[PDB]
């Protein structure tokens, strides 16, 4: 079976849930692939009107893997980015991240409408902790979504925080016990579902518009500083002691 | 007696008070003429530093009636919009929500300079519960002042919150019990009011501006996608049902 | 000895401390020209990561004294601006406010990266409570760092909030005893530090750009009302009962 799969919940809303065990949700080919196919099969039935996206286990989203960074110190690989298969999806999704976060893997639920984190799980925006700057519009993301001082310190340290410590902190998205983190983003997709399909399109594209008009420049100007902090000589060695 | 009234509560604190018993605070004509003439008066004493706008019983402001939404869906009238109104008061105003604010008249209280709600009470940006996109520069305001998700889960769900919901969310405005809202509101029109008008007026033009500049074209778009959504088939029936 | 004064704390981490006693750390000269001095020697060393800015006993930061500003009521001096000595520093910044910070002491240290209140010292943007309005870009700083709320609040009333209080409210920033202020900024500054400074002085030029940006016309604008606000005839006296 392919390892993103597609189920119906009722009145049109839809749960897209990431399964590469192999990877731990990594953006293993398979993940990419399998997100592409299942956006495309929701973009494609007008009957849906709100997707939950989640992961399986422990995990929510690894982002890009070690072995990854290791070869793209070498120039095998160029960055990876998901942000244009989420943002493009014209109804609203909410990120469960039942499991683990980390790098792109965040981003990957925060580029949502909205989000729900579990409070044993651990989340990371963690370039800096490899020694490099972020990449994915992160900082602006991470400042409107999570606000400027939970995204400066979580940016700069590169760190692992439990949703605990999150919700401790004033994170403003719920926190729920890993079991009903799933639970709690269907019970939300059936109120929003409520609405006409119509209203629920026209009022996210406005929603949306301000950081949709900001997100190309942001892309670009973290990549730009990313190839100067990423192409330096210590790099590599860090990266192999987080192994 | 006129359904608007203006009291005086000392040291240029003032107080308008909203008792339209027949409409529960609607957006009335008789409550429309009663804002703007006291608003009037207000602008007419140099002595008035403060202005505390509040309601009556359980009720701060219903906005806009089904009555007269179902008269909308005829084309029997256009969008009520008393921004202006409150937008073009030059000194600072503390809404004392100690009812409920539904709609538009949650918006109203938000247009001020503070906000306080109370905790029994109950709190909506219901245009999308009878299925149709925000009027009034909603997703602006409830951006800037409840934080962008609150601002994103009430607009989407149009559903009632209480004030302690609210308050257990982290919304950023003091929420007290019913019966301590106008105290509240009024011990803190007395601190405000210890400074010199002329720097009173000078500091709510400064720090307003920023809104300003942006609220004609946030009042435009949410017109015009609001006029595609209010007019679709369904509509009439879902604002029936809400009777 | 001089009034300010670097350490070195290990791994990158250094400390400037601010002991003007007969100031209680205010703008006096000998505090301006050590803040220039010593982050002089900070852009010196190559080693250096990031600095942790701190006070003395009971005080952060008193910011300009009311002698000064009766000196300015005659036009005797004009404005204190400490903005460019810390905006211009290229490594972060985290601000220990161990003690009170009052008016330009409060800005100084919130135009850090990072910012460390104390439960039990009391904070202010006092500018108000003399009668007139801010300078330093405070409603630009505080929106941003604090949040539009506690910002509207502060500036409008110029009142004194203890940490305690500040916390209770939901300020965005750690609040912790003050004997725990210090080493709660130390310990943030070692995980800081772990990275790569060229990756430190490459994200944090990012960060700094949005408001960067804005804050010479923020700094103009704040100016321009305040010597309007300033130049009135009862400000002499309000600052005179102040003593
Ligand atoms: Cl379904
Ligand atoms: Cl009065
Ligand atoms: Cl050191």
New interface residues.
Partial sequence: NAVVQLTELGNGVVQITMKDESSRNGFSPSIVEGLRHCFSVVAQNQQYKVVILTGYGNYFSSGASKEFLIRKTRGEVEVLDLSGLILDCEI?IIAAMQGHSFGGGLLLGLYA??VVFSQESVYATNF??Y????VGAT?LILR??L????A??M?????NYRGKELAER?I??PVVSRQDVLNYAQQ?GQ??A???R???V??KQ??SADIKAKFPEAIK??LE?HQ??FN?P?IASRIQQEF
């Fill in positions: 609203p409408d909205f800096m902790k020694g490099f700057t972020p900082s409107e979504k606000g400027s001082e939970l400066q310190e940016i700069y340290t590169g760190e004033g403003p998205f939300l109120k929003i409520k609405s006409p119509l209203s629920l026209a009022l406005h929603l100007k973290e500083i100067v902090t330096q210590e």
